[model samples]
Target: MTQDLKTGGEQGYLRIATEEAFATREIIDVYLRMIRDGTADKGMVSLWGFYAQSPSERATQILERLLDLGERRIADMDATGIDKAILALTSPGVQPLHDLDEARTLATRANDTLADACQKYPDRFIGMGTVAPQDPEWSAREIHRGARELGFKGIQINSHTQGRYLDEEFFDPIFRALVEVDQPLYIHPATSPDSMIDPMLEAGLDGAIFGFGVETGMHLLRLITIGIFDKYPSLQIMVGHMGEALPYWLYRLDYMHQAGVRSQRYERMKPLKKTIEGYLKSNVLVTNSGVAWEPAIKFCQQVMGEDRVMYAMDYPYQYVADEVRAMDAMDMSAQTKKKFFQTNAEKWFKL
Candidate 1:
């Protein structure tokens, strides 16, 4: 039972900022070194971030930007104190490739590379698939290939594809295909083209620290207001930073959704009562990644319930050990802790 629990909640999202091979090393370093200092325990699977540039965009400029990643893993588990990691393609994955044929080829290469890594480190890594959702038929084929051929645990995608939110008619085919497969879609937030980042930075705010939350929260809200959750009941979305403030705002959203009916924004949508909360409880799971809000975590348990919460370390992006230590000591129930640490994630990844 302990082993089963241990192998369950350890799943996380990894980035592939650079090409595949180097990205793997960065995660290994985090688990082996930075996380080994007696601060936290490892989860069942650690998601590795092995992002790569598009084929046509794969040049020295891309390499230099991505290669500037930190070393978060090393071989000494006893020394660094982390267990294992799961791997996936980073954001803007192969979707950035404008040429459909070139995009398809990149998707295959990326999946094959990830498969090789998983096979090479079978015990330590779990694989999730990637897709270029702009092209529906090809996206469906890639999803099939990832599951049937590559044997991935799930799929990860940005909140929007080609600047369109998930609910747009253009994304329906991709959503329907994933729903048909009954796999989770990890929604990583990507800033819109009209992102007010530069101005925000000029005014002394960090783009990612503040902007990501606002942007992603809006994206999730859009999905809720637009009634995507009502359409596909089985689809799952994993939100990092403990549901990106959604848990806290559930009540407010409910009241607003009730008031906003026939208000043009949510004109076709029903009130968010059970749809938002239920979707969050049933179809959504969250990671402790980059968020250590214990009181908020407990509030989430009280409001949305604890079954949706899970464990994660933003890895090299955020210190793995620190996040693990903080969450492990929360005031929630032991069952909640175990669920957060293991069971929920196990179910998400089908471990």
Candidate 2:
């Protein structure tokens, strides 16, 4: 099901850790020790397949999954595939912390510890660091440390810091800092804290599996609606699952947002210098992670353009065999397929 997408003699995608949070509470000590020891691989399979006592058990599961992923990388390559995997912080990352001080501390610790992990296995692992979006200035400074001092490939960000929205004026400094460093930020999914789950359940929906699209899409629309693209045109953001259904909806978003309706939400968010399509066409990248469905990838390519898509197995979590199968089946040109499989990722991460 795999095509050995990596170019030259190598055969694996070089992955960097997308920033994510280990569930806090009682697991704090155990999770921190795991991070300190660079042990996320040991915890994953158990976490996904079963429930456990305390967050420590879950953290251990996460570490195990990471280990499983590491092992699979070799197996994939021995079978002639992309052998390397990049690591990022876990999802619902640092921004969920209400305590700004604690959030900052956790982010710093994650970045520093991730750097240590990369150093431990420089060839096999690349680490992506974290930032607290609430305090953008402090976040900016930390970005300096993460990229310049800590030496990670880049930073990973959540769709929103709690419910504050990504393009609000408060978060601009963080984008500016990333622009200054010329580092890309992986904009992973997270639920809005005040998000109502009961309503969706009554309507027969899975929030994370489906709701993430609406939540993250709204976050991104807010960016364009609020003129984030105009202000920070060079800031690169990587979105997964082919931009989380956004690619297919851009035409509608652009037309509706620009129709000059007084009844529209957030009128203060002024004239967009670019259309939703334009921004996506230029500033974003999407990965073939959870959304491995064939039609979804085709639609994404048509809307997002093949050049802006990157290949990923989603490895231990999403099933590498299925991911590889999905990509291998797409009816795309050889060159276009090459970019989606490898080129865009190397360019986006500056590898």
TM-scores for all candidates: the values are: 0.75, 0.79
lDDT of each: 0.58, 0.63
- The residue-by-residue lDDT of candidate 2 on 147-218, one tens digit each, is 888776677776777567777777778888888898887777654444543454445342446656666767
The candidate 2 region of ten consecutive residues with least summed lDDT is 40-49
User: Residue 257 of model 1: what lDDT?
Assistant: 72
- The sequence of per-residue lDDT tens digits that candidate 1 reaches over residues 78-151 is 12234455556654455444457766776777678778766776655567777777787788777878888887
Model 2 residue 28 lDDT score: 42
State which candidate has the highest TM-score.
2
What's the distance in Å from true for residue 305, model 2? 2.1
RMSD of each: 10.2, 6.1
**Residue 306 lDDT (model 2):** 77
lDDT of 1: 0.58
Clashes of 1: 28
TM-score of 1: 0.75
Candidate 1 residue 281 Cα shift, in angstroms, is 2.2
Q: Pick the candidate with the highest lDDT.
A: 2
